[PDB]
Design a protein around this nucleic acid. Structure first.
Ligand code: MG
Ligand code: MG
Ligand code: MG
Ligand code: MG
Ligand code: MG
Ligand code: MG
Ligand code: MG
Ligand code: MG
Ligand code: MG
Ligand code: MG
Ligand code: MG
Ligand code: MG
Ligand code: MG
Ligand code: MG
Ligand code: MG
Ligand code: MG
Ligand code: MG
Ligand code: MG
Ligand code: MG
Ligand code: MG
Ligand code: MG
Ligand code: MG
Ligand code: MG
Ligand code: MG
Ligand code: MG
Ligand code: MG
Ligand code: MG
Ligand code: MG
Ligand code: MG
Ligand code: MG
Lengths: 124, 147, 210, 52, 52, 51, 124
RNA sequence: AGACCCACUCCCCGGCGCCGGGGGGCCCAAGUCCUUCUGAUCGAGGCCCAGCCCGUGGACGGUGUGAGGCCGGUAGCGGCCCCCGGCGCGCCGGGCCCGGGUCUUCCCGGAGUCGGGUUGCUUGGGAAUGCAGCCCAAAGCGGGUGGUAAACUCCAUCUAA
RNA sequence: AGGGCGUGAAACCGUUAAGAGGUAAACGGGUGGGGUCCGCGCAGUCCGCCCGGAGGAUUCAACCCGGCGGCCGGUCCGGCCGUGCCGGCGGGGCGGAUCUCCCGCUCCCGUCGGCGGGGGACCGCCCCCCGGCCGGCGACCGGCCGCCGCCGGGCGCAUUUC
RNA sequence: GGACCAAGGAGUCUAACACGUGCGCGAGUCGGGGGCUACGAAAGCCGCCGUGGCGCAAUGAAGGUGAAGGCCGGCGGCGCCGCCGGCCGAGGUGGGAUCCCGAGGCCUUCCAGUCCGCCGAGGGCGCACCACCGGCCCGUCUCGCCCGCCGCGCCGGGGAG
RNA sequence: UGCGAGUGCCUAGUGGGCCACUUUUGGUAAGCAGAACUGGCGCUGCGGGAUGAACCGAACGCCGGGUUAAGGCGCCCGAU
RNA sequence: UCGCUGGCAGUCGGCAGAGCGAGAAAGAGAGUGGCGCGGACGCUACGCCGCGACGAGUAGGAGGGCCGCUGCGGUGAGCCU
């Protein structure tokens, strides 16, 4: 995400700012030069960025470098990426609601017969 | 810690937070999850569709060791070997292709999800999917099957 | 009674589970007792290996595990006689034996035979009578140098055949893995019924021609 | 910080000897009383005998 | 009270080590030792190391 | 001790895999940061008159 | 650093007294003896303390030097002043002001010195 | 078992004697120093330029409050004295005159049991997992098992009573 | 502490003292009266600066000698460190799913091909020695110089200082 | 319900699940079982002790299958597929905190012009998130035409909606 | 005309009600039984109705001053 | 109590120059030419300070307790014949 949003046009050699954690992503091959500021960076992410030739900053250094935070691109992680969010909203077993139910285990015998089929009674 | 919980704040309040009209009785709805068909019907329908009834076949003596087959994706394919291998393969102009044996890593089937870097490979797996095979062909490389 | 959205659970607490609850407060005591007994055994068998007899290479049975090797029960009679040790002498010199295990292939047989012969070359045999050396004994130079070894006598380590980079052959490029797999499935599924239809057609042919 | 000073080894008589070693980075590791407290609190219950 | 109360607690090894590093780091600041209450007004150097 | 716990660049020699924990902020001296020309430059005038 | 050590010891010091809705610090070099970041006598890079002399005449002024911060034995330099009240006050005021030595508390230093001299004066 | 080759006299126990853990018993450091409170001190102060003395002994208990040095203990791969066993040694006596490889010729197994029908109990075991009652009642390239009853046909793996 | 005897509470009772008493008693708010005690109440605060008057000191400013300390040297000299970098006709440890001389084994009439290991090269990281930049010495300084301050001792001698 | 007073006296512990908070590590994570080294039955270490759990892939009752494409150039049977080779290569619309640019302008005599800071019409790249449109994977249905070969088959694969 | 809005989780208690102006069904009627709208009581003290769950006024932190609501001003009892 | 998610690190002092409340954006801007040694308090920032509006409550919910009881680890050169 950070590389994509920093290679979006216009925002060249600006400082990416994360008030969270920068984790490593193994399904990406080439790492550009980066100027990151973050609360904490995982060890492999640090190794990748520094080997690619980037610079990692803490927020005190960011404050010293730019008190008004100008020249910065403020990012965040996907807030609804947690597995908890697929259980929310319109209740399962209600027409047009793709909500994940709470099942003890997934399989053939667990919550698949009567509110799910059309042969076994009805389908929601 | 009992210091921090709710029973300490309820000292002096008569009903202990359970109301006075409807007291805290013992089992005012039946033990466990009884009445799923009768008086908890709409709870069961509204949050547990498909709970009642049967569907499908039976398998009397099922063996997960027989049914065991982990999968890996073309995104993670290059992670299974050291990056020294990838760097040297890209650097080398002879045309030699590194061998990626996924059974050694512990995977049996290769599924092709994402991009694959422009580099020849010999992928040595047990099963393949059609799209994974076409992507490996497109990058230029071989899929060799093992038993 | 069920409440708003939640999971429906099945606690197996309807028997009298409290009259039989196995606590583990004596776990450190059991560990200390086990290791004290282990040390006592190790020093009652003075120069012999602490872990006991040598054990052979074994493949794990099922498809989930048939790529790994481990230690077995004992060396089989066939590999033991190929190596040339006697049935009643192997376990008195420190070789585990089990007469129940077969030998289906030859590579595993030969690997176990190599392991057994290397162990035999490695071991040191003290004299039965300290002042009376015999033919098969070891000499005093290594008798003064014999000692215990810790852990498994010869650790069984599974290694992978290093395979180097190769040029890609156009035949390997033209190989069609998914199609071959699906056709193998189909052939294995339709083998018998195709044979029955072939026999039936051959029969119809014989009364058409006879 | 990052700079590591040079601490002298003291003889048994009390005065400094001729030897000295650089400060290990452990003494420059971060200090967090909150989870020091957490770890102490949780580990301190592990030597406790049961009663009933 | 039953004997099968949860008497023992588990903590992660990584933060066990983190806390031990924090304690070592805090042991080498004179104000923290004084705050803890040790009388070290006449110690030559705080990370006090002696001969072997 | 530094063999036990490693340095900032060298991993621990007798741990399985351990390194020192990173710092969330390097320069903890807050007064020095606040009364610095870079930050004093980009500030408005204080309003300390009580109304 | 000073702020970090203050965060550590703001509420968990053996010099801290909490009773009667009042808070105090009994550390050696704390003027006004109150628990405060400014007046704390331990966490600061440079500090000054004012004590009664060993004998019942004069005042001892304790200065914290700059070099040996981790060497407690040679970190504080003492100076005994036994004069009249006005010259003692002038000497303390000069010591702070014209050395520019932590000047936020020269007034408190002379308050404490005057109190100590008043106590040393004979009582009726 | 026979024949031919190679190898072998290092086994055991019953007694007798000799050499290097357990049980019991008795012991092993240092202030009742000076001054001063108290009904009684184990309290308080002091004992230097060796910050009284011991400390591998500052656990505990007793003693007219509150004791490392008053007493018992505590520490020590500390000591001494008895008794029992083992691992070791030598002697006497007794028990056995014993192996392996190759070829040839022979030998080779557990029944009112297995299995089948039905009935009752049991099990997750579902056209019947296990057990039992009654009836039927075996075979020898046989028999058992291979989680759906049955027939036909190849494989695998064991050898019940 | 007087043989069911450490401490000795409440309900209840006796007596002494004070007070009160025809709407059972008790209670809230507002005063008033009377008591028991306290203030150790009973001629009522001090604190700075200045003016005036009587006093008494080893006495002030300045100067000199010594010690310590705080800040600097536009760029004084020397060190040490870097969660920095650059070099190396440098000396090593760790790792590598990066490559390739010897030994062991197996199958072949001292031989070809094969398997296990050891060795060597290469790569990455780290440690150390050499040289060069950069940054710091405000989690981490030493010496010379300059300024300032303080203390001790002389000298100061009374329109000063106290 | 209640003569009066004292003492005692009632949401606890285990397991499971769900959500919210705090900490460590982070596409991984976790030794809890085992092993090695007075308080200490603690603590430390193991990584070829990660076996294993949860997560990283879903869908189908099951056999099973399993998560972007377009363009260029010509041919074979206008287009389309394949041979090919190369090129680009991982969505779009609206709203979006923040960031970027900048018509001009912020006085101490007057003009010109420098630097720094600042404000700013208008214009941009757009986080997380919401709404909508497309796309891909599994099951199923409808309509169709091609491709593959070790076994050309009651074979295998592919397309559109 | 007035006002800062949108949005997500987890959630206790409740699921016996009663009264009043106007509308209104059964009944001779009811301090009866049953509905509609709004406001109350329940969960709420305060001034007036002598007295009162729901009536009239008005809703409540601890206080000083002033003024009113509904209701009052022979005496009880503040005010002709 | 709530809101302003208001203000305060500027205690910027002889190495000095005292300001940021006032209808109407933004410089107490830098440069180029034409004697007497002195100055209160403050800021446990989990602190201090300034304005506004508000304050009924059973069932129930939440927050704060320098309220209280017993025991453990630290600490007070704590107290006591
Ligand atoms: Mg309540
Ligand atoms: Mg509740
Ligand atoms: Mg009740
Ligand atoms: Mg209820
Ligand atoms: Mg009810
Ligand atoms: Mg309940
Ligand atoms: Mg409920
Ligand atoms: Mg005693
Ligand atoms: Mg004494
Ligand atoms: Mg004593
Ligand atoms: Mg004692
Ligand atoms: Mg003694
Ligand atoms: Mg003794
Ligand atoms: Mg002893
Ligand atoms: Mg049953
Ligand atoms: Mg079957
Ligand atoms: Mg008594
Ligand atoms: Mg008594
Ligand atoms: Mg009385
Ligand atoms: Mg009377
Ligand atoms: Mg009664
Ligand atoms: Mg959650
Ligand atoms: Mg009614
Ligand atoms: Mg009610
Ligand atoms: Mg209400
Ligand atoms: Mg009301
Ligand atoms: Mg009336
Ligand atoms: Mg009023
Ligand atoms: Mg009236
Ligand atoms: Mg309220």
């Amino acid at each position: 995400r950070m590389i994509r949003k920093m290679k979006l046009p216009g925002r060249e050699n600006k400082t990416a700012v994360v008030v969270g954690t920068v984790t490593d992503d193994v399904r990406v091959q080439e790492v550009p030069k980066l100027k990151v500021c973050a609360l904490r960076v995982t060890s492999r992410a640090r190794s990748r960025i520094l080997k690619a030739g980037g610079k990692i900053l803490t927020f005190d250094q960011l404050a010293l470098d730019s008190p008004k935070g100008r020249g910065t691109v403020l990012l965040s992680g996907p807030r609804k990426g947690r597995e908890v969010y697929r259980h929310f909203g319109k209740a399962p077993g209600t027409p047009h609601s793709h909500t994940k139910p709470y099942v003890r285990s997934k399989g053939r015998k667990f919550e698949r017969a009567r509110g799910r089929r059309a042969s076994r009674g009805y389908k929601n | 810690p009992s210091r921090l919980r709710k029973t300490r704040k309820l000292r002096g309040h008569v009903s202990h937070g359970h109301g006075r009209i409807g007291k805290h009785r013992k089992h005012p709805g039946g033990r466990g999850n009884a009445g799923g068909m009768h008086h908890h019907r709409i709870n069961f329908d509204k949050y547990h569709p498909g709970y009642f009834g049967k569907v499908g076949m039976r398998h009397y003596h099922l063996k997960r060791n027989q049914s065991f087959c982990p999968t890996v994706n073309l995104d993670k394919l290059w992670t299974l070997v050291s990056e020294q291998t990838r760097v040297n393969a890209a650097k080398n102009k002879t045309g030699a292709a590194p061998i990626i044996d996924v059974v050694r890593s512990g995977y049996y089937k290769v599924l092709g999800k994402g991009k694959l870097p422009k580099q020849p490979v010999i992928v040595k797996a047990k099963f393949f999917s059609r799209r994974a095979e076409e992507k490996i062909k497109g990058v230029g490389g071989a899929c060799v099957l093992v038993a | 009674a069920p409440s708003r959205n939640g999971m429906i659970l099945k606690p197996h607490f309807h028997k009298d589970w409290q009259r039989r609850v196995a606590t583990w407060f004596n776990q450190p005591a059991r560990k200390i007792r086990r290791r004290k007994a282990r040390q006592a055994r190790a020093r009652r068998i003075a120069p012999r290996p602490a872990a006991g007899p040598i054990r052979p290479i074994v493949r794990c049975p099922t498809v989930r595990y048939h790529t790994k090797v481990r230690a077995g029960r004992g060396f089989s009679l066939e590999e033991l006689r190929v190596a040339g040790i006697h049935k009643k002498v192997a376990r008195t010199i420190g070789i585990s034996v089990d007469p129940r295990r077969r030998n289906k292939s030859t590579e595993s047989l030969q690997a176990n035979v190599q392991r057994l012969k290397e162990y035999r070359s490695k071991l040191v045999l003290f004299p039965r009578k300290p002042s009376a050396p015999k033919k098969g004994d070891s000499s005093a130079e290594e008798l003064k140098l014999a000692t215990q070894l810790t852990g498994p006598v010869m650790p069984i380590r599974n290694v992978f055949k290093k395979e180097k980079a190769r040029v890609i052959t156009e035949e390997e490029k033209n190989f069609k893995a998914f199609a071959s797999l699906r056709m193998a499935r189909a052939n294995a599924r339709l083998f018998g019924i195709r044979a029955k239809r072939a026999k039936e057609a051959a029969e119809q042919d014989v009364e058409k021609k006879k | 910080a990052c700079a590591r000073p040079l601490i002298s080894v003291y003889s048994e008589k009390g005065e400094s000897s001729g030897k000295n070693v650089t400060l290990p980075a452990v003494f420059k590791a971060p200090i967090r009383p909150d989870i020091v407290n957490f770890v102490h609190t949780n580990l301190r219950k592990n030597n406790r005998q049961p009663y009933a | 009270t039953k004997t099968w109360r949860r008497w023992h607690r588990r903590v992660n090894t990584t933060q066990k080590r983190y806390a031990i590093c924090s304690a070592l780091a805090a042991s080498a600041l004179p104000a923290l030792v004084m705050s803890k209450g040790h009388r070290i007004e006449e110690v030559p150097e705080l990370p006090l190391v002696v001969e072997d | 001790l530094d063999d036990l716990y490693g340095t900032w660049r060298k991993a621990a020699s007798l741990k399985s895999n351990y390194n020192l924990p990173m710092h969330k902020m390097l320069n903890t001296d807050l007064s020095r940061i606040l009364k610095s020309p870079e930050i004093q430059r980009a500030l408005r005038a204080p309003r300390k008159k009580i109304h | 650093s000073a702020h970090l050590q203050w965060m550590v010891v703001r509420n968990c010091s053996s010099f801290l007294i909490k009773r009667n809705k009042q808070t105090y610090s009994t550390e050696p070099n704390n003027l006004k003896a109150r628990n405060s970041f400014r007046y704390n006598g331990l966490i600061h890079r440079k500090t000054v303390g004012v004590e009664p002399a060993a004998d019942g005449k004069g005042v001892v002024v304790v200065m914290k030097r700059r070099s040996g911060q981790r060497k407690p034995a040679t970190s504080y330099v003492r100076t005994t002043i036994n004069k009249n009240a006005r010259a003692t006050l002038s000497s303390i005021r000069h010591m702070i002001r014209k050395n520019k030595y932590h000047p936020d508390l020269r007034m408190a230093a002379i308050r404490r010195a005057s109190a100590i001299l008043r106590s040393q004066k004979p009582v009726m």
